[model samples]
Target chain A: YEHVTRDLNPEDFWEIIGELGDGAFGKVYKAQNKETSVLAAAKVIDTKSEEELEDYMVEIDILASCDHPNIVKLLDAFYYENNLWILIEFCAGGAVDAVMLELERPLTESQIQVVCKQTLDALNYLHDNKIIHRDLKAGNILFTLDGDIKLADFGVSAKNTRTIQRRDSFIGTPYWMAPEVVMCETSKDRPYDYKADVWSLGITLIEMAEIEPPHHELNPMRVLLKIAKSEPPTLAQPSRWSSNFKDFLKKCLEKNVDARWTTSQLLQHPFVTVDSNKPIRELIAEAK
Target chain B: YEHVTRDLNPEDFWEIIGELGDGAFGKVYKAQNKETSVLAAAKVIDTKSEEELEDYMVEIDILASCDHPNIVKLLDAFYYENNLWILIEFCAGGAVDAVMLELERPLTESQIQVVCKQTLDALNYLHDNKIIHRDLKAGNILFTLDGDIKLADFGVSAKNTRTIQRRDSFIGTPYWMAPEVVMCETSKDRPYDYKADVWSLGITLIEMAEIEPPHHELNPMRVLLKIAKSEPPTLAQPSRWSSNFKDFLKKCLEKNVDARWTTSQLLQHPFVTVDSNKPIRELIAEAK
Candidate 1:
């Protein structure tokens, strides 16, 4: 486990404004730097023991290391009593899909392209660093006030060990999980690779299209069961979408782990590439 | 931090049935042991960073050390990916205030004495171990289905050093905080002692009488301002209550820390002393 070199006391430097949302282990609060007044989302977490502490350290390590524009930045981290107040770059634009839902319609094809491209850029960066974004969804796709899309929430992320290319962990939301990843939950044999994120991105596409995830109304346990046995999902109105968009989803939702396209391969898809010149800011504001 | 000796895999041993309440670090769920079917509360805390994991460890440390009947027991602890599943003693009786509110009025003097005494027993036991139950209130004081009062939710608790009697960190809910504890929040010089809990217990007594904590109508910030300036309060109809009950409250709500009664002292007060013989189960059933 990693340790902070200096004692970063959050109570001394940060003035919490209000709670933002649940950030895995604890509450995420809107906090400001007392001296500078810089806004930040503070993930205030309480660890009960050393093992739990190590898990938290893993997330902080990942956040501190990833400095790509596509990834949310970690400003600072500190201890205040039982909690670790992690200061992160706050995106006031909020969740992309939540805003999309508020618009009462799916994101346009062009808007979807930009979100997919930026997120793929982030995923490509993470995979290049041998880190897996185990939990990726529309909710985790945050937008800045300036309309820049950033991948956030590395709570269930994993760094690949040199000893193994595949990771064995039953993590992630059921509906968005790759079939191979779901297998890891029930059995100890099957291990999954970075392509699992590509699968989640595929589901997130459907979420952006329908303004909700597949089986959004079903029982959570039932969703898990369905994801394990069900056929791959297609777009709500595939006939109306471009051929390349459907192709991208097909490669992503491939049940066979070996067949699923990696993030870089999906980056090359026409749906994400053809609409490259589209301005993302205007589309993001429409959703807002 | 302590190591769990067994292979505590929650997915293998327990089946979560429903949610109990929103815990500080995560959601507390109702789970049953797969083999025996014994029910327990599982606090599903995600370890986002080392800080949160350490906070969870601190709570486990407290729960592990406390084996008293008046304290909620920690049954087991295990890991499931990023989430730490902490199984605790389930109390279906819920919060003391909730039970009192459901009962449709304030508790009788005898009932209040039993609750005050049971809580004091827990407080005394905790204080004797140099552990401060920093957030003591009716909500934190829970009862079992059978009516036994147990102290719960040590989220903001602190361990005292033998060398120092005063704790400097300002924590706990505003309405429940003693004057000295509240002062510590704004000033670096003012540190509070365990008698802070005694003051909270005194406020809880009034909560029992009024069906709400003091300054229930005012804004939270306004309540804090008033608590700092307000005198010790008693029942609305003070003449209707026995002087012994009022005396017990007066000792608890002492504005000066030096004048406040300790948990042990409050336990021996005439009001709490008079009703030590009543079976708590039957008393609790009346509220049910």
Candidate 2:
């Protein structure tokens, strides 16, 4: 709505030196400002997309509604002949999922803690604003080339998420659906809410730490059957993981909504202890 | 579940030593063992009333599942013809609700603290077991003749939780309701969990010290509308309630589930401090 007040045009922008990554809802191109020499990720929403059909821009409206350090920022937008383009800040390092797949090694507990705190802080802010990110996975986590993690793709799926929606048509990926979501509320009578995000976060936790996460032995359909019948899978090699991390996993994967840890509590977990005055390796040594 | 194993016959139950109380279900009569003379309160569930049949058994199931020293005990149950009955341990003195109406002055903060800690301890156990008491009020706080507060109806509202198989529902008393429960997500939003009970407990705190609770002049709908529209109501005035009691109320009344104190965390609050030793006045005089 504020953007609606900032009246602008599109031919006013220029490009910098980076190639575009994942392209979906817009004419996303790596572009820069000729005036400032600053690098920025410019996403040009085509006039053709359904979102641009009406005057209300759903994704832009959501992004503009928030301003947080971890959340990807919307800088400026302009109207071209037909396409309505919105520019965003560049997260040079790309998605965390890509980085982890490339590394193929477990990250230290402290490193995970760092990202966890930032993500909680971000999510807590969004929740305060009455927004729920219906989808959260490791792939949605954004990172810096220097290894600092920032969260992106917030409420990415919330746009399409049906309100008052109950369905077996699961929108979240095969891996991170909460047990209730996995089994379609067969485990308990209540619908899974933000606590479902907590479950997804637990899966994301496992995905970050171990290359071959739990549920490896079981086939795809059986994996969900197991989740509905029992508890969310625990970390496979918990002993190899930090004690604090294991403790956190126990709370994160709690099947009961009443007992499930929230983003605020998740930020305060022993594994996510901040300002310990040591790097991950040093903290690992101290843990022993 | 345990009742299936206890296998007690309905013919064994005998009638009243005293009248304990009355409720929406039935009048509670204090029954006794003919041999042991051990006291017990019998809650005769009138099966002829269809409402009790719909909700009472689930409530009993929830109560049976819980075990805590500060909570009222559910000893045994029987069903014969049209009556479903439960015999629980007798607490003779009275309930907190009656005490408020009978006493000339409101209870002191220390007295409130004593009951708050006891209630918090009981609620914590329920939370630990992944249960929430949908209905919580001062009337439900029973006092033992020996001068100890016990939280009654710890799981009586589990029936409500069972009924709303999906969207968060507002099944509890109106004014004591939390903001989340008042706005109440009809679409599986994480509106409230155990934290909803914490908010109710906070209202009960004000009810004890004040002649009328917060927003006292308002009708139920208006009170709920205020609770939903505004932040958690503040203590009346700095000088009105004990400063420490106000601090305790603030901690308990956080509307956000994540920001609100967890049951265990609140039990340790400074205001809820319990002196482990009994008869402190007499003991201190002797020491002097």
Candidate 3:
């Protein structure tokens, strides 16, 4: 395990805070500027042990190149002793994942709306920029002291696809993985774009509502079995949910990307807004 | 357009806080105490608008009476604005709703663990209190300065059971209604009590992972029709969930109350501890 502060020396910057979390790749930490005390998160991925260096370069390239409100940044990066240490902004507010543990229930509309709106902006930004944030969930999003949001952990892939390569290699949490990933053979090798991320966002939003992901059943096989057969769970519009909001959940729940609403579309979904319509129950009751 | 503020005037309480958002039964305002310089939230409601003042009083009663790290509090309340203004501990960090919007990628295991732990605690607290937060979702949870979590929007229900003792009429919710609620053929003047709440929690957890429910595809007509004619949305764990977690979800998702795991039982489930012998997956899948 390589330390961010020790051994790894950067001519341009210095100082390390603490570990953020571990991933399939490596661990991340919080760091600060000794001169200014400005804080940043330091991510260290061990690459020396790997046979190839492409994944490291790709993750670095992706972070270094992007500058969006939602995307995590690479303020500075350098390789020291076979490990790469990357300094990014530190969120005193921390990741949504860290915060989820502190409380025991769902959040209010005031909080949910602002965050959703901001994330949608980031999603749109990434989609337009031709980059796919293969992973999207509440935990990946971090908050600053000022209440701004940023996306972290654009997981590195061994090989950045050159063509529209479809894939079903089983990347990402099973709960958040889209239906296509499990049902379609082409999904394994097909080149998925931003749409896949949208599905992940939907899963993330749902997770934020309650806490645990669907099929909390720990059996990986069962989860796969279901994902292999049925669609993920949905947020039934509680009689309590205003029609507008329930409608929004419906839009996000669409399984097909061709049918699934985009983040841009969701911004207008009734559930996201205050405009009340026929309550979902009444609508369903009447429709039935 | 309301604010809660100084001057000690009841109507003047609106000055300190601006209108954050409005729900079906309540108007939310961000407030502050000039005396303590502490920030808080103020929700105003006409204790008279609701038919059963006794039932309506539950919001205040529930908020004031309960003490859980998960539940929002009735910090201060008084007759004001020709109605009752209930001041609450301000959550500057915003609501889980906001985080949901802003966050943009899958959460890590560590993050999900935090959220799941808190949710379980909150549910346990209410269940132990013999009270059910019939309505629970991402939007009901709030975040604090230290990324603390708490349940909010208590008693915002337009028609809480305190109004009528009719089980059929005491509707819990429509969109995310649990299977048992749907299975009832006739509305009875009674209470769903704790089991009903468990159903809601199941939906909350399942939706988090899948982002859609089993019957989400079928229209309301189909959903109600199916429930009326056959079964409610089967709390089927999809393919991606872990077995242990899936079992836990299954325990919660049990359609029959007798078969369902009580909150106390759930708290004691082996899966509750990280060291449980039964893999979370098998328990979850066996639920299948």
Candidate 4:
């Protein structure tokens, strides 16, 4: 036990400023590392009050362990007071989910393409490394200070979360969970894979078009059943979205898991073209 | 980025037996290794619904990395359906907190001592390695089929949880949080350490005597305020427990974290001495 030492004390290194925002698990704070004076986001979770402590552990594990430009980077982790705290990469631009909510409008085609391409680039990295990000949605998308879209969390997708309950009782988000995931563990023969994530990225495409997810008003259980039993979902007003965007969603929403496009294949779609020179907003305008 | 290999699948080795119960992340289930027929516990987290996926990863990282007889072992991890699953060593004797509820009475002194000793032993190991079990409570304590108590769930306590936050809003159980944690980030001079856990273990002693945590009936905010302003809590019925036990609790509950005793010093307290030959229940009966 004495062999592994993690001795960083947050109190010794960082000074808290104030609350940054509330996330799914707990509150995020903006803090300054005493030595560095660099501002970072700290996620605070009351382990005792927290409903399920496992998620807290996994959140730290993913953030503290994984380092990628497109993935949320964990700077440091340690316990303080009565809480489990994680120092993570702070996105000055904030979550794309909140941005969509504030704008009260779907992003332009080029903006969608930019976000989707960067998201795909992140997924391509994770998938090539044999990790399936089964959960993908607008809420998991964040924008860096430079305005680059980054895929934020991967709690449900990693190899560490392995022991699961019976298939029916515990379900992922009805809209974001791929059909393959929705149908999982029912049969011995059916196996879900990275393509399952392709389905979610497709649903996220619609999330970009609509602020809310598909059938947002419907009950969660009903949505879960529909995703598996009903035909694949499409754009709300198909004619309004560009043909390129529609085609991208179509390939992603393919019912046959084997038929769904891979991350590499999707990067080549006409809708995914990236013009590197322009700023993201200007790039969106130029593409249009 | 491509070096980490996490390619295991749960369907290959395990099959569900039945629902075990709720876990911190999601539902826990009784599962069997397909080849060995050995039963294990599976914690399922619906990663999509779950917030900050990295903590889930951190929980597994700690469990899988640490090997200890006194701590629950993480056997394996994988993904299936829409959830991240962790397979762990199953304890049939159930959680100590649940045991307290089922008995509906205070645990006998010997039983409490047995529990405390094992808990301290686990902490000793953790602290020696510079780890603090930040979230310590009756619920996080478990027993095996042989009635050997083992520390369960360090999801919030591991080294990976090292981020800074204001102690007030990110409070653990109002009753269990060390005073330093409660005052956190507000005052720079006062710092918290492994001794913070000694304080929680003290509260657990009261929990055993009372059959509930301190300030169980009060609203969380009220409890928080009371904990901060009022003197440290004593046993519900102080007269009912021995002077040694009361003294033990007092030392563990010391308001000043630095003034608090270390795990090694506490182990020498007469309260921790127990007869190993007798069964825990028999020892409890003898003490009564």
Candidate 5:
């Protein structure tokens, strides 16, 4: 119940300009500091209960604890009226989902490599901190105006304690959900660990190369069943991707959770380490 | 940015008992008031920026303005540390989705009628107030320990003003999204009005009776495409339901937005008006 600031009004410090977009709980707006003139993305949530506010704290706690260049920064938070205001660093380049949708094409192989490297770095950092970003998707992968990759959206993330090293909850979007997580609902014995994030990262990689992830055509519920019962998904056109990239996906999409590559292992993979000078800023500019 | 309570800290007022469940923006917890001893569901959110806080205001504003028995009530709000705390009246019966999952079957016809009637009552109130609950699903339908129906989750709700009588946003879950909303992204010409909520309510009725909404088997993106291109969906087995029930679905699921029945009109329908004494509390206890 300790607060960083008390008896201070947020409206006195920030000026809301317009709505940026909608969030899972509320609408995100673009706002500016009244004095500092710094721009930020404000996430406003109208909570109906204390339980709902706790649900949001998971992300806030994780974001506040995080200190990495690849992770989005939490600037400030305020509770005014019936709404909770969360201020975050504004990413002018937008989400990777928006860029792909605007370009109407998948990232080039080199661009994919850059994205994979930066995202894996962030994942490695999070995993080392005993946190699992349960939901990893292109939409969660955001970029700065300079095209610096920043992983956003920690809503479904989990922080492991010393005793509870594995998570059994059925979280994450169906399309990006790991096989073990998909099976966890039906098979209580199949609790997943941090490797689940790796599996999602693999799917996110595929999402980066393709406009959508595998099973995009199928129903989400059916996709969950397929993920649990069927073989691991692969890129639609393996021949088009490099051998290194194909091998990376193989390690990522391994049906056997124990056999899947860890974030550290993936970071050292040839595909991620490959030299690619292509600028991600170009894609951002093109999308704009 | 005027808060209701300025000096009071929520921790002094409420004692968190345990985790209840997750929410769209944050985690929900079961908490008891230290003074009044009243139990509540607390929603906690950690905001990153000021803009994010504004997004939450939409739901808060609507919920605050609403005064209906069928709607969930917002009890209190507080800002402490980086989190926003919202206390709401606790519904011990849980969500309708939980009941359906526990029962392993859809609601009986009588039960569906009760839910439909109550939900329509809430929707009618909202529509009359020029509010559109853009997201309506079984999950948002809650119940008290006494089995009274309560509509929860107004995160995606929109309020129509004097000039802006229609909304044109791609909001709501894919399976439950109205055809007009689904098409709004690509087809900017298809701005929808309050009738969109009626379509979603119709889908919610089917969900109450079928355990899942239509296109639950398809990918969300694919479902959006299907919703926009295909004819309106109906109960898979129309024979199992009465003519009144089937007719109610037809009016609710009408593809032509202009022809769709309004919340008030649906209240007068035979299915909703049909006499049924089957207690919904029985379903709740059975689920327990």
Candidate 6:
């Protein structure tokens, strides 16, 4: 609703290079500025009704307000021919899942540590701002052309205001959803806060380490049931990982929100602080 | 978004009589037109953000488009101060739930039949128009001074379009939700259609008969699990009702959507058509 560029035609400035992928609301394209030749991911969504238009505005408002190196930057937004075009900084290195698919293997422990540290940095910034990225998974973790991790996707994100700190909506993909979020609709005591994102962050860590999250073979319904009723998911081969890495996972995958370590605290974990300085550009080059 | 009345001050037109009740979005007040002296139910919702404003517009658009005898009419809408005012036809006899609370008893068979017939007619109209009243319950069924039934509340309603027919949103009160709607978010094959309302109608029938739907004693989470996993709910004393009534409930409460009766078919059911001509004005008066 705010900061929408006026008197500017999106087609006049950006040229659609290729189809990047589909987003939560519409198709995303690999766009390049005609004059500057700078690249951006342009998400084009049809304006169906005022209700849906407002939904797109929510993402715009959130993206416009966010200023972080680890978070994808919103470049511009425009309304052209009954469609909204949202241009964001293009992550040419692609998403974590896409890289893993191309490489046909999980990231090495060092690479995973780097990804986790950068993602945790982004989460720390978002949580401090009272914004919860409800949908946090491997696919939402994009890397810049330089292989720097940037958190993407805010369509399902929510802001925790003073009047309403905890949310009760059953949002987010089932596999990465926290137990409190999955059961929040009916559970009176399960309204979730920023801690819900920590649970999803843990699932994303598993995804980065194992090439997929736990219960990937099960259907979403069964996966949700498993997440809600079963014990917290852990690394597949805990013995293979370092003791500090295992402890980090334990701190992240805690089912009890009260016991789960916050992003600031997790940033201090030995696994995140020790070898996180390792470069992930080699892995990005291999995926390319 | 359309049909919003402008250039007319709501305060200059209608005077607030008293607090009526609360709605899904905000508070409801009993109001009267200053010139016509006609009474109306005014729903006032604070305009918080663009997203919330669009949400209020959804109800207004649906109410403006609806033109049915059994449906409450939208008289006017005004954007006053930072709040949205939605004025609808006031039901002097109040909601069916309030009437039952005053009488301290469930509706008799004849009264229930009248309510069912009128409600079925409304549902028939709505479903034909591709509208699904996701939230249907005894509390949403209002009555006029003449004891005529009028269906109210459309905040959670959805329109079934060509591209999106079956909805997968987890909406509506848990106690009255159909199994498909309850499991829709995760169950790939369980997206629900208009038949979801029929399931809720059966639950409402039980509410009208017993003063509460089945599983009312349980917490909302447990009730949702019961509705999704257990067999369909039925009347507490099925044998106490007539055979026709039992058969009608059976058809309405069918778990399998394909086996459930549509609104058009249910309108012809024996229980709905038989003894439905009986006047409920006496019962309304008694409650008053």
The per-prediction tally of clashing pairs is 19, 1, 113, 30, 52, 0
For this target, which candidate reaches the highest TM-score against the unseen true structure?
6
At residue B127, what lDDT does model 5 achieve? 83
Q: Report fnat, model 4.
A: 0.00
User: Distance from true position, residue B232, model 6, in Å?
Assistant: 1.6
Docking class of 6: incorrect
Chain B TM-score against the true chain B, each candidate: 0.83, 0.77, 0.68, 0.81, 0.86, 0.87
| Model 4 per-residue lDDT tens digits across residues A1-288 | 111114456768879988878855677899988888877888766766434444456555655555567888877776545566677777766677777776667766677888898889888877765465646888778876666877876655543132222223332212111122233421112223456677778878887788766767776545555565556778888888889899998888877655778888998998888855234555333323
Lowest-scoring 10 consecutive residues by lDDT in candidate 1 chain A?
A170-179
lDDT of 5 by residue, B1-288 (tens): 343343567888999999889866779999999988888888888878544665566677777778998998888877666567778888888888888888789998989988888889999998878776766888888888777788987776665542122223223222222222223321112123566677777788888888988878887656555665667777899889999998998887876555778887888898888444356978888777
Please provide TM-scores, in order, for all candidate models, with all chains considered together.
0.46, 0.46, 0.40, 0.45, 0.47, 0.54
In the range A2-42, model 2's lDDT, one tens digit per residue, is 47423445445566455566455544577777787656676
> Which one wins on lDDT?
6
Off by over 4 Å in 5: A1-288, B2-7, B161-192, B274-277
What tens digits encode model 6's per-residue C-alpha lDDT throughout A245-267?
Answer: 78898887876665888898899
- As a TM-score, model 4 comes out at 0.45
DockQ of 2: 0.01
Candidate 3 vs. true structure, TM-score: 0.40
lDDT of each: 0.70, 0.60, 0.55, 0.66, 0.73, 0.75
Q: Candidate 4: where are CA atoms >4 Å away?
A: A1-288, B1-8, B49-53, B160-191, B275-288
lDDT: worst 10-residue window of model 3 chain A: A172-181
Candidate ranking under TM-score, highest first, comes to: 6, 5, 2, 1, 4, 3
TM-score between model 2 and native: 0.46
